[PDB]
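[job 0412] stage=complex_fold ligand=magnesium ion status=START
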Amino acid sequence: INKEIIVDGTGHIAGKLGTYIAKKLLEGYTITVLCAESIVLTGPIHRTKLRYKDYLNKRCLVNPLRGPFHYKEPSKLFMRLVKRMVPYKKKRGAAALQRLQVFEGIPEKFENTERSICPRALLEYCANPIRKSATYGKLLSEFGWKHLNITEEMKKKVLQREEKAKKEKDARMEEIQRIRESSSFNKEVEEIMSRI
Amino acid sequence: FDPCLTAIPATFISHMRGRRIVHPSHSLLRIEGVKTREDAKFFLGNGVVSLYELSGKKMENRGRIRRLHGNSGVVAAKFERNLPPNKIGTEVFVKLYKVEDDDY
Amino acid sequence: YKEHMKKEEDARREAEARGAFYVPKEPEFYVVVRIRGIHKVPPRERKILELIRLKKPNHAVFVRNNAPMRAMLHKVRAYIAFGFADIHLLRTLVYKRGMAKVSKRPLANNSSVFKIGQDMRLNLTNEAIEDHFGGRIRCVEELIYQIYMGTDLFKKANNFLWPFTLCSPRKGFGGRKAKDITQGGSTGCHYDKIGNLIYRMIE
Amino acid sequence: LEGDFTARRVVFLKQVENNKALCCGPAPINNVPFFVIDERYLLRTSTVLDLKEDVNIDISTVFESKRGVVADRMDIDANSDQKRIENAIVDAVSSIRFMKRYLATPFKMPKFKSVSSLKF
Amino acid sequence: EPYLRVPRQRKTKHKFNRFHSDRFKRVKKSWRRPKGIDNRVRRKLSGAIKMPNKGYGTDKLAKHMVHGGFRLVQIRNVGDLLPLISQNRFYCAEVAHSVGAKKRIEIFYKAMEYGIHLTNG
Amino acid sequence: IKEYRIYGSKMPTEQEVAPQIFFHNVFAKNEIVARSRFNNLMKTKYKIKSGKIVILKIEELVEDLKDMKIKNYGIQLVYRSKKGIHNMYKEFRSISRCKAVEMLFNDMAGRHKAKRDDIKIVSLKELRSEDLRRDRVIQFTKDDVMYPVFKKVLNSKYDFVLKGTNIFN
RNA sequence: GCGCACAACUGCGGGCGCCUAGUGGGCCGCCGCUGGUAAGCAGCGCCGGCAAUGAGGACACAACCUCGUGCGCGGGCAAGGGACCCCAGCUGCGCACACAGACGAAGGGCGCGGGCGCGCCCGCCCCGAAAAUGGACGGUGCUCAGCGCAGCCCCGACCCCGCGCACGCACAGCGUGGUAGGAGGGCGCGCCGGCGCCGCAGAAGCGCAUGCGUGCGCAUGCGUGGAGGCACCCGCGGCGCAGAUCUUGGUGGCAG
Ligand SMILES: [Mg+2]
Ligand SMILES: [Mg+2]
Ligand SMILES: [Mg+2]
Ligand SMILES: [Mg+2]
Ligand SMILES: [Mg+2]
Ligand SMILES: [Mg+2]
Ligand SMILES: [Mg+2]
Ligand SMILES: [Mg+2]
Ligand SMILES: [Mg+2]
Ligand SMILES: [Mg+2]
Ligand SMILES: [Mg+2]
Ligand SMILES: [Mg+2]
Ligand SMILES: [Mg+2]
Ligand SMILES: [Mg+2]
Ligand SMILES: [Mg+2]
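[job 0412] stage=complex_fold status=DONE, emitting structure tokens
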């Protein structure tokens, strides 16, 4: 069984993507989440910013060096979400979390890979279009994540290279289909089945 | 002989348990491609083997799929020796023949 | 049994051939299942469940359709599910889970000397029935007949049956079983739909 | 499914005592001798050959393949009636077009999509 | 080798060590029923160790069986071998610890004459 | 749920050999609630309590859905809230009478949190389109009404799939 | 004295005596109350519980809910649940947008959804609604994980059922929680009257193993040891220790 999933994070509700990720992780899957700046948080953005400011307010008064750490990246904020959907203090949950790697955008390590989606966690499936929503990168670019624009530019250059290679590959799927429909190919094929 | 040649791989996902109390004699397996309860009825009574290595020496722990579990095709299996919780997330191989509760 | 049931259907359809309404004589017994557990029972209700021989939940008995027994069933109706069994539910309860309450008799030639306080729960064999009822009844169906048609032998036949130690029902009670069935529970007069619980409880 | 051979399309001859079954994927075709295994380890496929011959063979010396052991049995033997009934199913396999490749090819699991796809 | 093969059938592989015999070396492992008022083993709370019961007792006929079906017999001299001569298959014989090596020689030789299995030798 | 017509009367005695027969049309979950709703109406309209009632007949009123068109139903009901007891009139389009009250129960629960036992139905009448009083149910009585589906619905049960796979269509 | 005679239902053995313990601070819930502004306050009645009641569910949690409880195995369930933690969910119909659901009043809201005659009514929401370490629907989170409903299903206790074993019983069977407490039968120790034996070819003791045993404990192997000991039946008793700021002795950590 191929138990390695590469999830594209755009258009996904965050906690709804995280449940299906964490349930796979505890079953031995290795999940990588790309485009984590585009993972969606439903509701209007000001409610989502107040939830983040409530998160930023919680710190150890005695020693904030050991307090609740506050993550400004969308990748580490989404990792923090799935971290408590597993039993991470136990060894079974911490081992599952080692099989997550969450990235913003598409790094060039993941060029020409085969990306997955969780359709039960998609925003267009779960949410109503009347309702508001906002992504991680929309939130966290106003909380100290300075890399939204460089992520999207390097996201585009990956998608243009992959669209180029898909334009070449499906033409090869076109010509192989046109070859395999040809009567020259067929009578070549029935000649081999005649000899067997 | 590969196990995946004749047997369908199933991931050992949990023991049969409550919220806290765990009954380790029955192991819950998720067979690949089996997603509903009636689909898993095809695998009731089927033998199952868990293959492992002890000091580099191959061992076969054989079992039987005993009952269904839930609405999502999870089945409960009882083996000769109970599955360790270390092997949660690893695969066990579901045979295509039925075995009996006495004779694995 | 078939002739008695066919006579009632012929009595019923002849009444609606005219304008009339015919309901038959209601049965000579109730079938009662203990629903609630043995905890937190007040002393009156605990006593009535003892005299109905319902000492654990998922236990079933037959009680007679008396006016005193109906008042007893009403006072513990928050602990029991009771109703009317037909002949199919009567025969299924006895043939599938039916045991005999048999006193030991140490002498073969003298059935008058026996032990009082110790009664064995044994199989409902023909010979156990033939020994209890002194040759008057000697098979299981002949014991059903005293239950079904409420004869003078009802009290002896019903007490000879050990209380039916049923299983908990398949597919559950389907909710909050302690409240009344008129409120969605499983506890009260299931007037003729008492087989909807008990048939699931037998195996 | 579970034998010495354990992924080999064979053909079923006769049910033997102590829950065993006589089988022979014909040794010219797939290099499989006569054997008996347990009755259950044979996964049944829908296609049946047209064999008319009597299968009441002198089973006393046929190599019986147990479950887990892959013990290297001795090679082929005298085969008094085994040569005749092997040739009858080589006769049966020759009538059907691709059936020779079928019995030669080792079994692969079908790509799972549903349990309807697992009919055989 | 036994006359009748008796399975082992001990109802648990538990040992019933005494409570806190892991934590205190003054508390020996020989079982004492804990009688404190708040004691979690006496109160049978979940997570505590189990206490011995009537329910853990092995079968009456399987009890004190060694090597399958045999029953141990203490032997102090060669005269103890004589009642075991007819019943060889029922008893595994065991020479007592304090028997000297001079008398253990004579026990060992008469036991193989009478066909009695010695667990010491 | 089902519809029951439950016939009952006072138990006949030597003083009253043929008592007055009553019947009630109940939308209930089963016959035991239907006996219960009958026994209260004999207890509260008349003074016949349930110990002296014989239930003469219980029949399942089931409609024939031979060609299965949609009818309009106007339902006069009385529901009890936490605060009081009120009258309501709701209009539904449905298959049968027993399905329209199921639409009543799911609507009173969704819009008013009225449970099924807190609702008593005064009358259920199948209506013409011209007699309907709610403009929302009138819109679907027009011939050649049409609308698209805007909600996405999956075409299987999936946990993770590749991006190209159609899941909604 | 003669004669008559077994009396509603259901269940079922019952009556009485003797000796003796512990207890005589209670607490909690339900319903019903008294005092009190109230109180996790105080004082009652009835029943149930905790105390002494484990286990499951309640996030944890003496008392709530389920439900009792030998040791296992198999089934079926209860309460409670079925996004992930975490076993178990899908199909449909509604409703709501407030960092809401996730403590709340009087009083309000051309906020939304229904209903009745601009005013009312019903749901949801809003305002009223302010505390001090950072932080709690249990958490993650969730805007179909919220508020409602329906259908079918599933998970889930030591419960119930079935089987097997242990123990108790008056024993074709039934039963199995337990503080204070009572009782029975054993294990163990010093010595006694006996009775079977063992030991310089190595006794007791000790160390480590193995085995038996529900358990108290027992037996053996090997090592050590260097002169006594064992088993059983009896009898006597200064007869069994984790505690007593125990006693005495020794030794640690603290601490180079
Ligand atoms: Mg107080
Ligand atoms: Mg309790
Ligand atoms: Mg508790
Ligand atoms: Mg708990
Ligand atoms: Mg179940
Ligand atoms: Mg789960
Ligand atoms: Mg029990
Ligand atoms: Mg006890
Ligand atoms: Mg005590
Ligand atoms: Mg001694
Ligand atoms: Mg001794
Ligand atoms: Mg002393
Ligand atoms: Mg000490
Ligand atoms: Mg003490
Ligand atoms: Mg010191």
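Strands of chain C lie at 29-34, 59-64, 80-83, 99-103, 119-123, 164-165, 189-190.
[job 0412] exit 0
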